Amino acid sequence: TFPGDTAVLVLAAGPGTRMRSDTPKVLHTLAGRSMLSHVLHAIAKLAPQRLIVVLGHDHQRIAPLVGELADTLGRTIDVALQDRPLGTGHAVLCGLSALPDDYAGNVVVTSGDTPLLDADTLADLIATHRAVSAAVTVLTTTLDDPFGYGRILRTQDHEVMAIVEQTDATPSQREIREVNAGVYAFDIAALRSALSRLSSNNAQQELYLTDVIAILRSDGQTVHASHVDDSALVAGVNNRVQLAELASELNRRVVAAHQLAGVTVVDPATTWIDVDVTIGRDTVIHPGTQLLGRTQIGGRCVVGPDTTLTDVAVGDGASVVRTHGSSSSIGDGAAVGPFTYLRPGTALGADGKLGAFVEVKNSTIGTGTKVPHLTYVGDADIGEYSNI
Amino acid sequence: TFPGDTAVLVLAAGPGTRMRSDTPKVLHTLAGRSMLSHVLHAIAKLAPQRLIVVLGHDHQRIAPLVGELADTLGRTIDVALQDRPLGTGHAVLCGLSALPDDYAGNVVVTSGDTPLLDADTLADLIATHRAVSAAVTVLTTTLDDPFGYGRILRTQDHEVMAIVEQTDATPSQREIREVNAGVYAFDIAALRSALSRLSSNNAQQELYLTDVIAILRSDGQTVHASHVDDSALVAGVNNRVQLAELASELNRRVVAAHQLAGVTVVDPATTWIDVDVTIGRDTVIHPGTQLLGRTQIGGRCVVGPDTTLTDVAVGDGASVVRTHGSSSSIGDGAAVGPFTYLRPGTALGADGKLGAFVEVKNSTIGTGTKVPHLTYVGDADIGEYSNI
Amino acid sequence: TFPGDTAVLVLAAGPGTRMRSDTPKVLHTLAGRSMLSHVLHAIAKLAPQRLIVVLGHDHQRIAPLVGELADTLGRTIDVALQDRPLGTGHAVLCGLSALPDDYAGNVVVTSGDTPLLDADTLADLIATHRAVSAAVTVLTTTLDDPFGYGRILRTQDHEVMAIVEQTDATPSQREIREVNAGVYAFDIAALRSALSRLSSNNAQQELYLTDVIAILRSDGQTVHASHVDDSALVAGVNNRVQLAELASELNRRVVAAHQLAGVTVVDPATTWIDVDVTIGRDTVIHPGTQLLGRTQIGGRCVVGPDTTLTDVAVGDGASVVRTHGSSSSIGDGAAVGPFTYLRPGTALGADGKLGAFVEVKNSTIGTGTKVPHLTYVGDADIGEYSNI
Ligand SMILES: CC(=O)N[C@H]1[C@@H](OP(=O)(O)O)O[C@H](CO)[C@@H](O)[C@@H]1O
Ligand SMILES: CC(=O)N[C@H]1[C@@H](OP(=O)(O)O)O[C@H](CO)[C@@H](O)[C@@H]1O
Ligand SMILES: CC(=O)N[C@H]1[C@@H](OP(=O)(O)O)O[C@H](CO)[C@@H](O)[C@@H]1O
């Protein structure tokens, strides 16, 4: 977590055009959270002294949610509005408009569309920054395909010189594969000063935040880039292709953590587990399964195949097979499926049975009660050990 | 599209033994089209002056379909029959039997089993061929595993010498990884001449089309090979293993195009979209979904998970979840699924509901009509805003 | 298969802690067999003169099954019990306690958690061992990630010196990527002698079997390591992450063999086929399908999508779509699904139909009998060509 007097700016003002969506980019959803929700969670964990989200384009619709999140995380989150889209640098300049004019602390600039960004990466950033006592630290990474991203230019001694954006690069600089991750740490005084000197001269007619690296190099200040090996943690999201690739890479990591904690997952590539889901030891998840939202599964269960559960509580030793359910509970040792539909409000007691072609809506089903097949049970209370 | 006086021969005469199937190889199906259908579509788009499909082995069963396709593409397609399987070169010689004896135009020889072959690749071929004013241009590619394919031999100056087939290669030439793609462009006069000189001497006792590259090299004519980086576009299909790998690579590209045009696809690896399918902006497709045939999905929909739709029209803002349907329409704002079965003839109006364990056959269901669960509706007309 | 007087020790005494499971590691299940079942099958095929499984930790629960397997494979399998977990070397020393004190034959030491280990790999091992007339042969492999495994140390002439375990390695030796596979072949006399000299001095305070390679090198005896290119065949299983990766790699190979023998499998990554399953020519398996246990599918069938069948017999030309069934038979030309549930005891004759939302339990359904939708048929006999 964070030394000491630290302020983090989350930049979320972009137009998000390439998503091709009426829903603002950062609100696009991923393993149970919006990209923005992930990024604010990761950041809050470190507990900066300040947390500033720069909203732009769609602030109207994003703002409410930041405050919604601000409460959840029991912490204050500031919102700065960038008026004109006059570039990422201007965005930072807007961010700063929300700290006192003489905040002495370090500044960490990150983005709203890097949902994989984690605690360690961020920490390491400050550790390096303070250690090498840098005026700026920028996180980089090496990609197989560097299109869209800005390129890190280095002389022979591996020393940083400047960052040149996709649009502005020569065709030879496009062959460069080391990219700007868009996560920074700044000496605050050394930042303000550098932003004052940015020109919109070339070539998206804009004020580039990247331009700062070359300015400060010329200033005579110490300019460190820190290479992040695991690109995933630092990858951005501009289109729905990247959104899916990252949804995939995060899922893989969520499943792995469950596997390493005692859950058999027969097919990780087709088992989808949202971030809040809990699962007990020696549970088996068969292929084609989504466990979404607040779903908790106990130990020694069998879930799947083809099972989707949103906000479902599942006891120990239950079996939930080919079921589509939500906002329900399933008791210890209960048997549900195949081809069962649990609508919200279904509470099925321990060792209850819900068989094939059974739909339950808003019903309490007592301990040991069987509903064997082809039945709708809606808005009803059923006693224990009965038979429907 | 095609300069100018151009004739393309599609070779589809092979025995297709390794498919191990009673259905001829090129008729094997892939994202809604037979390999042959893909290849004739790609080719027709460029509009050669002539289009000749060389049929052999199974011509009896393939021919009808070429003429079926010939109509669809509003264009004439010629069929040459190769009698004996006396080699790929003989096949070309058969192809030519369908042009006038003095056709002056260039000849493009491609194959029936390269379903990924696209417009640009083909164009580039002629552009290179005419530019370097070649007697022959052959397309190559580099593979991780070059088994089965023929090897490109090059001296130190990267200059082509000959092509040596899987069977005939030394074991050291098998270490070579650059392969013959089996797509060519020829100077017509320089082709005829070279084929006359082919011998069946070694080692599948046959007349190899590949043999031409070495002959023309000796002739003193200009022999260019053009390396294709994206192997996929140029990969062939000899067994069902390759068929699936290519079905996969094409799917990935179909999904990506949808993603980049505003469709959220949660899991591309398990979402299958045939080539004709249309999908509207901000639709979400959940995992385990096949959209097959002429299926069109509007905007702001939710399809999936576990949904298969063949030739289904789906309005804007409909939800189609765990449904198996075909030859049906689903109205704007309609709710179908989970566990719903739409047989051909189902027409469900705007804001209609078809609930769990409901099967509809050949029925009109009017606007706002609910069928909540566990019901068969067959051969019926139901009024608007009614309740079943 | 095996020369001549050969004895194989299968080591299965580990604590298996990293599985994090109440079920002993080697009993963890994989494509229809426990890891131990796979390994004993592969080994029995070669027909060693002796077969010794060293049980430790959980012998109580594993032993019965070895004898269960011993019968199936019509062959005797010996069980040696290792008392204290005093290391892998001690385990071997325990293994030997079950051969006569003067068994002259070669000894092959393999592990219980390498379920992919095949016939050829094993053969090649002895072929090399006898050919180079080695005192020990160890199988190695190169990994992208060598964590957990023991490292092969080689001087400049590629000659083996010693094997250093994960725990005991310097941080520079951890950069080494060539790993000990834990499959060996020994000259028996040269083994006994070397084990006598093992010390528990460093650093898991234990008797390492690996230590033998360095001892025998010093002895002056001939020490060969044989690199296995296909790591999969030789990969071990310590956690559920590896279990799934291997379940995946084996599946891929099972599907490929079916594809190459005439079965169309649209999506191999999401089609799961246990090892005993048979499938006929020109069958098509659609995505999301599991064929488990003793399931046999005839030719020209259609299975899937979303179909799970455990121990189901399926005739020629049947269609089994969106079905969840087990211990049942489905006749030639029969139509089952979508959303059909076959419980054990279901026998559906040729050209029978079981339609949507139909569950069958323990019933005989005669030739040409239809059960069109939304029906339970339990414990019943139905005549031919009838209608339910
Ligand atoms: C001018 C600027 O700040 N460009 C950054 C920024 O790109 P945008 O395309 O403006 O989002 O973030 C990228 C990381 O996702 C990084 O590659 C790039 O250099
Ligand atoms: C004699 C001949 O023309 N061989 C060609 C041809 O192989 P066949 O195995 O005959 O289909 O097409 C291949 C491309 O799929 C290419 O590798 C090869 O060189
Ligand atoms: C002391 C010893 O025998 N270690 C072996 C053995 O490891 P364990 O972690 O003890 O299972 O098997 C491994 C192969 O899975 C191999 O890498 C290693 O060198």
CSV table of C-alpha atoms in Angstrom, one decimal, chain A residues 255-265 279-285 298-301, chain C residues 17-22 28 239-241:
chain,number,residue,atom,x,y,z
A,255,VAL,CA,-10.0,-19.7,-12.3
A,256,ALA,CA,-6.4,-20.5,-11.6
A,257,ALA,CA,-6.7,-19.0,-8.1
A,258,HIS,CA,-9.7,-21.2,-7.5
A,259,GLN,CA,-7.9,-24.2,-8.8
A,260,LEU,CA,-5.0,-23.6,-6.5
A,261,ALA,CA,-7.4,-23.3,-3.6
A,262,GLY,CA,-9.0,-26.7,-4.1
A,263,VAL,CA,-11.6,-26.4,-6.8
A,264,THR,CA,-11.5,-28.8,-9.8
A,265,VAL,CA,-12.4,-26.8,-13.0
A,279,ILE,CA,-16.2,-21.6,-4.1
A,280,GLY,CA,-15.4,-24.4,-1.6
A,281,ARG,CA,-12.7,-27.1,-1.6
A,282,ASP,CA,-13.2,-30.2,-3.7
A,283,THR,CA,-16.1,-28.6,-5.8
A,284,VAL,CA,-16.1,-29.7,-9.4
A,285,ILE,CA,-17.1,-27.3,-12.1
A,298,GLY,CA,-19.8,-24.4,-0.9
A,299,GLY,CA,-17.4,-27.4,-0.7
A,300,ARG,CA,-17.8,-30.8,-2.4
A,301,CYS,CA,-20.4,-29.5,-4.9
C,17,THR,CA,-0.6,-31.4,-0.7
C,18,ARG,CA,-0.8,-28.9,-3.6
C,19,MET,CA,-3.9,-30.5,-5.0
C,20,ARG,CA,-5.6,-29.2,-1.9
C,21,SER,CA,-8.1,-32.0,-1.9
C,22,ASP,CA,-9.4,-34.7,0.4
C,28,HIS,CA,-7.8,-37.5,-9.5
C,239,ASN,CA,-1.8,-28.9,-8.6
C,240,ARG,CA,-5.2,-28.6,-10.2
C,241,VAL,CA,-3.9,-26.0,-12.7
